[PDB]
Amino acid sequence: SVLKKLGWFFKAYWLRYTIAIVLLLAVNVIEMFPPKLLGNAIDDMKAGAFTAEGLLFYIGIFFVLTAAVYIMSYFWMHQLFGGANLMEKILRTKLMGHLLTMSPPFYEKNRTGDLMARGTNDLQAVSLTTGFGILTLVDSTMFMMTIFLTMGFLISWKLTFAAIIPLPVMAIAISLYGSKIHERFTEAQNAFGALNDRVLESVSGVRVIRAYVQETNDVRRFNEMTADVYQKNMKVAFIDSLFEPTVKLLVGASYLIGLGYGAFLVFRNELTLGELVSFNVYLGMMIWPMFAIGELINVMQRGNASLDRVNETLSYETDVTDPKQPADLKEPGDIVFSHVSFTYPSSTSDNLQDISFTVRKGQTVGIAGKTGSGKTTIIKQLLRQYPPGEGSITFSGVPIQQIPLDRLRGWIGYVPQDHLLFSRTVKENILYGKQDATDKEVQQAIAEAHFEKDLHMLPSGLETMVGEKGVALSGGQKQRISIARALMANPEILILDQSLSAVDAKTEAAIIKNIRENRKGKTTFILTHRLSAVEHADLILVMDGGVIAERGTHQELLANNGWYREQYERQQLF
Amino acid sequence: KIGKTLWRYALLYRKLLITAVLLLTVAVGAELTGPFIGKKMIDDHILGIEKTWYAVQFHGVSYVREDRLQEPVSKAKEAHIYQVGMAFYFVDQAGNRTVGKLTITNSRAYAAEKLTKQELFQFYQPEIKGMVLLIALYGGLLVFSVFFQYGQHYLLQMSANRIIQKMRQDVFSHIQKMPIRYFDNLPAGKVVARITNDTEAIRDLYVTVLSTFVTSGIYMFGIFTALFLLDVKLAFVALAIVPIIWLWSVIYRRYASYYNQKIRSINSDINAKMNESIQGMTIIQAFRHQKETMREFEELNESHFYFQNRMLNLNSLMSHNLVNVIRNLAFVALIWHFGGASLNAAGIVSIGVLYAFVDYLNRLFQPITGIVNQFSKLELARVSAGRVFELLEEKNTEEAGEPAKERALGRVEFRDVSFAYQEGEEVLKHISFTAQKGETVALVGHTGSGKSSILNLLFRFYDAQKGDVLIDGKSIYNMSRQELRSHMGIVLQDPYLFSGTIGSNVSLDDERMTEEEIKNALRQVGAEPLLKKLPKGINEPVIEKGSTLSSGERQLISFARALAFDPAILILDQATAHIDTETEAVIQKALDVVKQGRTTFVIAHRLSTIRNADQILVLDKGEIVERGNHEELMALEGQYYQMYE
Numbered sequence A: 001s002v003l004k005k006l007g008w009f010f011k012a013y014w015l016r017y018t019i020a021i022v023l024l025l026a027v028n029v030i031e032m033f034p035p036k037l038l039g040n041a042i043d044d045m046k047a048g049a050f051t052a053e054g055l056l057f058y059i060g061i062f063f064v065l066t067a068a069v070y071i072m073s074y075f076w077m078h079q080l081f082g083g084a085n086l087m088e089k090i091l092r093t094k095l096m097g098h099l100l101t102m103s104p105p106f107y108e109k110n111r112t113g114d115l116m117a118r119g120t121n122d123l124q125a126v127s128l129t130t131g132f133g134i135l136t137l138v139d140s141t142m143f144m145m146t147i148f149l150t151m152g153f154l155i156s157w158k159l160t161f162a163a164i165i166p167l168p169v170m171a172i173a174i175s176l177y178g179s180k181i182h183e184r185f186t187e188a189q190n191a192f193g194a195l196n197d198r199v200l201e202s203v204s205g206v207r208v209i210r211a212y213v214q215e216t217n218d219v220r221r222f223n224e225m226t227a228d229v230y231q232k233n234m235k236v237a238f239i240d241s242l243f244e245p246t247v248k249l250l251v252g253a254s255y256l257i258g259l260g261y262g263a264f265l266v267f268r269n270e271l272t273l274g275e276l277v278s279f280n281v282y283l284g285m286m287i288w289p290m291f292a293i294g295e296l297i298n299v300m301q302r303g304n305a306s307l308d309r310v311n312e313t314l315s316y317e318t319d320v321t322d323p324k325q326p327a328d329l330k331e332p333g334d335i336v337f338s339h340v341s342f343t344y345p346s347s348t349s350d351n352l353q354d355i356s357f358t359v360r361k362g363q364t365v366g367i368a369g370k371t372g373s374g375k376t377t378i379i380k381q382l383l384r385q386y387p388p389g390e391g392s393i394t395f396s397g398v399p400i401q402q403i404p405l406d407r408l409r410g411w412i413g414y415v416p417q418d419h420l421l422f423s424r425t426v427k428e429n430i431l432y433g434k435q436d437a438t439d440k441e442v443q444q445a446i447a448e449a450h451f452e453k454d455l456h457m458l459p460s461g462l463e464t465m466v467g468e469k470g471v472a473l474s475g476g477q478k479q480r481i482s483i484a485r486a487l488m489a490n491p492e493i494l495i496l497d498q499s500l501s502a503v504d505a506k507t508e509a510a511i512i513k514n515i516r517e518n519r520k521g522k523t524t525f526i527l528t529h530r531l532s533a534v535e536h537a538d539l540i541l542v543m544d545g546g547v548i549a550e551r552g553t554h555q556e557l558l559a560n561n562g563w564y565r566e567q568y569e570r571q572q573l574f
Numbered sequence B: 001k002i003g004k005t006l007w008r009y010a011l012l013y014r015k016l017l018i019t020a021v022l023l024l025t026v027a028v029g030a031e032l033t034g035p036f037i038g039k040k041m042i043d044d045h046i047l048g049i050e051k052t053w054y055a056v057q058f059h060g061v062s063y064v065r066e067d068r069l070q071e072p073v074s075k076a077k078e079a080h081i082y083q084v085g086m087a088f089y090f091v092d093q094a095g096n097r098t099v100g101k102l103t104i105t106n107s108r109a110y111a112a113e114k115l116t117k118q119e120l121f122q123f124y125q126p127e128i129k130g131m132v133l134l135i136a137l138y139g140g141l142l143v144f145s146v147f148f149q150y151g152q153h154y155l156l157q158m159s160a161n162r163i164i165q166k167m168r169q170d171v172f173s174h175i176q177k178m179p180i181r182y183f184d185n186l187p188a189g190k191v192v193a194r195i196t197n198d199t200e201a202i203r204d205l206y207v208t209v210l211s212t213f214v215t216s217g218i219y220m221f222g223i224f225t226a227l228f229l230l231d232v233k234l235a236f237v238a239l240a241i242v243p244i245i246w247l248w249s250v251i252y253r254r255y256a257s258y259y260n261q262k263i264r265s266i267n268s269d270i271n272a273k274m275n276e277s278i279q280g281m282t283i284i285q286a287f288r289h290q291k292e293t294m295r296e297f298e299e300l301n302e303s304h305f306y307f308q309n310r311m312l313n314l315n316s317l318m319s320h321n322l323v324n325v326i327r328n329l330a331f332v333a334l335i336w337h338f339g340g341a342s343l344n345a346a347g348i349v350s351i352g353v354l355y356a357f358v359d360y361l362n363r364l365f366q367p368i369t370g371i372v373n374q375f376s377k378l379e380l381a382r383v384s385a386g387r388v389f390e391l392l393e394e395k396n397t398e399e400a401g402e403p404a405k406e407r408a409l410g411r412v413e414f415r416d417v418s419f420a421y422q423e424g425e426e427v428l429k430h431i432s433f434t435a436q437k438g439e440t441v442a443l444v445g446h447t448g449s450g451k452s453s454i455l456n457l458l459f460r461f462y463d464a465q466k467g468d469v470l471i472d473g474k475s476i477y478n479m480s481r482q483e484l485r486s487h488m489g490i491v492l493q494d495p496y497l498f499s500g501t502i503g504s505n506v507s508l509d510d511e512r513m514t515e516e517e518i519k520n521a522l523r524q525v526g527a528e529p530l531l532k533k534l535p536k537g538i539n540e541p542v543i544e545k546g547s548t549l550s551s552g553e554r555q556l557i558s559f560a561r562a563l564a565f566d567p568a569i570l571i572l573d574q575a576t577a578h579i580d581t582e583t584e585a586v587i588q589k590a591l592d593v594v595k596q597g598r599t600t601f602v603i604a605h606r607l608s609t610i611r612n613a614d615q616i617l618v619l620d621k622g623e624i625v626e627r628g629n630h631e632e633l634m635a636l637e638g639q640y641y642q643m644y645e
């Protein structure tokens, strides 16, 4: 299976290992002559015919054979150990190529530590298997095959069908051991994924842990998990230590049968002491290296399980998010929702009911209602991060699909309600939006989200390193970097998702004033809970559960009695 | 010193390793006694025909060997048997092997007849008895080292597993006793790698590398002892061999250390970078940075590939390829010494000894093939030990007093205090304020004046450089931060929900609140548990944060868990930002009123939620401006309040 799964790599490179199989045959035969040479030499010594020139011939043959095997197996080592590295690298590239270009509904079903390990640990295991396991398997198989052939013709077939009797038992034992070790190793790989997940969770949540004083209550859980992992490690140690004795037993049985029956053959005069020594050396080289057979199966089944994990993660069908047939219409200004009955993958109810939303040309639309009413669900309908069940964004006539995700994603502005950054300088993560921005538009977006003053606090303006996540930055600063970054693009469609909830009222005034200046005839989706930036719009939809309670602008809402009617006054009387 | 710590962890388990080595010593002793049976079967039951003969009867005359079945005391002929080619000859009465013409020039000549085949077979019937005896002897001897090998393997497996468990536990405890700064300035994947992807390197250093090393070192010692038993001159070269392996371990180290450490560092970078990409995959799939992140990754991947190829040559002139050069040099010596002994026909003594040594060479190299296969892992795990050990041996750590203290009055106080991250950014300057049981709220519009800096200074996440913080006159530098952090609770500005049910998230895996803490959820959560199909205890939110839940709902759960714990001081950080919906934000301040039971620090950028506070601060630019209440509004807070309405 691991061979049938890794073959396509070899079918891609059958110029590098074809040269290496012939090379291994050569180095095995040349290194397999010395046994018979020694048998002949000792036979000559016993008869008293050992002559000086024979010693010179023997030592010369030994030296030349040693040099030949040295070099001509150095090439075989280099080739195969390089092939393993190449396999690992290409698999890693494929794995990250599949992780990308895949919508967010898979990250709820797939872990960040399971995937991180499924890259690093799984690929190092597959590399170790590709190199060392295949090396040993091919070498040992062909070596045993040829040793069984040479002792047959060149010594005898009775002495060699007789130490072969115990090898079928070896085969059945090797079958059972692998049959168990495969399951054990798939479990071990999943367990490493789980361990990485737990450590990642603990590391990410540290202030929440320290502020609550549960260091000890977490070292307890880690200790229990490590104890369970030890228990599993010993449920496999039991089997591995019950396997080795049968291996060594059978090796010793083959040795003893060969030795005794060869002595008996010598008694019948069908074989000589030189031939006895040769056969014993042949068996010693053939069957005694089997002590590493258990490690070979360990490597080969660990690799099989790791590669099965990689394969099952590497083909997931990437959800429903893909251009079917590019419609190739540059953005119509109309976004007309006809009937949208949507149901998240991890839900059993229609989270969104039929919503007849409609926004024409450039019109700020305000969507703000009870929490949990799914306004960011409607927004996610636009971005097509989730499969469409009944959604009909209907850009002009054409539905949401039939658009390039590159172009559709270029139309949208951004949807970061929770703040997100990357470990770099503030300049670089502002440049992170659009096509690397430009020379001075960075400063424009800086002193366009009322963020210029902040640079005084930062010791190195636009140059100080932004720490991992939000380290070295306050919450309002980080949101003000997000707005700047995503205003670098001057999007035709802008989506604000509670983008003003992490800064003061005074700076909120600057943003809305500067957003009013920036947004003139460009459609904007304002989602907020501060019911003041929603005052200006052609339409304001108040969201209640899966349905919009009321529709209108800032005026009729204060006329019709409803959610918006009571929410504005309370924020006004303050 | 890496090796000393490895030895100490090993010595934590002495019984296990000593018993295993003793059992394996027994097994190897049995196996090494093994080949003497081959030696003494050759020299006796095959070469007894070649020694003098004074029962074996062919033709009805010839007598029997001196030591053989049916031994009366009788010697009349002193006959002998000699080997010529594939034929044997029988001389009746009292060298060279030239063919009824047998000559021993050393001269006298005698007559002998060919022993045919059936008559030759007739000779070794007693030899058949001896062969079956010895064969059965060794066959029985095998099953004793059969149950010794099993025992020693199953014992080393426990020794390795226990060692790795202990090391992992120690590392985890140490990382939890590290300062927050350490985590602040290091990627999560980088630290995570040093715990999970780095200790696996040290596990293999124990499970297979060192276990195989001791087994091979136990097999080699026995083999050299047996070689000394047989010969004392060829055993001296055998002893010389080991310094070769020492020089094979020194060279593979002076040539693998740098590249192995580079590979490990690149692997840490690759774990960190992959974590970062997974976390922020929405900015990759919404701002079309996919190709640039792929390019960065591929840069790291090709660097790792290059260093691995910077090691692809050292491992190629090593291992079995090079283990076969010692094997053939052993064969050459076994030929040369025996030849220099047999030039004058003095080589017939070591015909079973020759076979024993020939078998011994086959013995010795397989342990060596085991040893060489781990030097790649040995020098790789030396790096991993250093990275983990440096973490385990760290002097900037903070001793933690685990015990939590009792309830304390809600008395917070701040003297002239001057905090600065990285010694240059003076966040706070001369901050001084007090509270007894009322709501003291810190407000600033500057957005970078250090509100959260004050909050995390109170928790001693970072140590202040000036002044002192005293709760009930208790300097926070009394350490035991578990008592300092148990008196008080925080709702983080950016909440982080853990995995498992929302009830588990509120409970936080503590055995203090029973299932009937729904009141905390029902305190401020309206119909959300009714919205979601099952109650708190049966719905598991998506692992890590509740991406299946909204930001406001996550913040609701975080605030509930802050209230689920009952702190003497309730600290909040923009606790009502993403749940600002006033229908529920008013239930958190109307039905969940702070009341006098708590001393609460309400932080927020909206004046509505702090209108009833009895102490308001400005702390602009790290310096305070106003100390009055809501109605004490003249100039600065007036501006902020006016725009809100």
Ligand SMILES: Nc1ncnc2c1ncn2[C@@H]1O[C@H](COP(=O)(O)OP(=O)(O)OP(=O)(O)O)[C@@H](O)[C@H]1O
Binding pocket: A344, A345, A346, A347, A351, A370, A371, A372, A373, A374, A375, A376, A377, A498, B547, B548, B549, B550, B551, B552, B553, B578, B579
């Ligand atoms: N990944 C998801 N899978 C399934 N359901 C989800 C997912 N993310 C969110 N939900 C559900 O969608 C509901 C509606 O969307 P959401 O609450 O994010 O918008 P919202 O009402 O503005 O939130 P908020 O008021 O907190 O700002 C959430 O209450 C939650 O139950």
Ligand SMILES: Nc1ncnc2c1ncn2[C@@H]1O[C@H](COP(=O)(O)OP(=O)(O)OP(=O)(O)O)[C@@H](O)[C@H]1O
Binding pocket: A457, A458, A471, A472, A473, A474, A475, A476, A477, A502, A503, A504, B184, B421, B422, B425, B427, B444, B446, B447, B448, B449, B450, B451, B452, B453, B454
């Ligand atoms: N680890 C750190 N190292 C250095 N400077 C930091 C670090 N964390 C925060 N800072 C910076 O030090 C100052 C502390 O301000 P703080 O983080 O408390 O913001 P804040 O006043 O609470 O603002 P807001 O609530 O509006 O975001 C800011 O300049 C902030 O960006």
Ligand SMILES: [Mg+2]
Binding pocket: A375, A376, A417, B550, B551, B552
């Ligand atoms: Mg929302």
Ligand SMILES: [Mg+2]
Binding pocket: A474, A475, A476, B447, B451, B452, B493
């Ligand atoms: Mg802040």
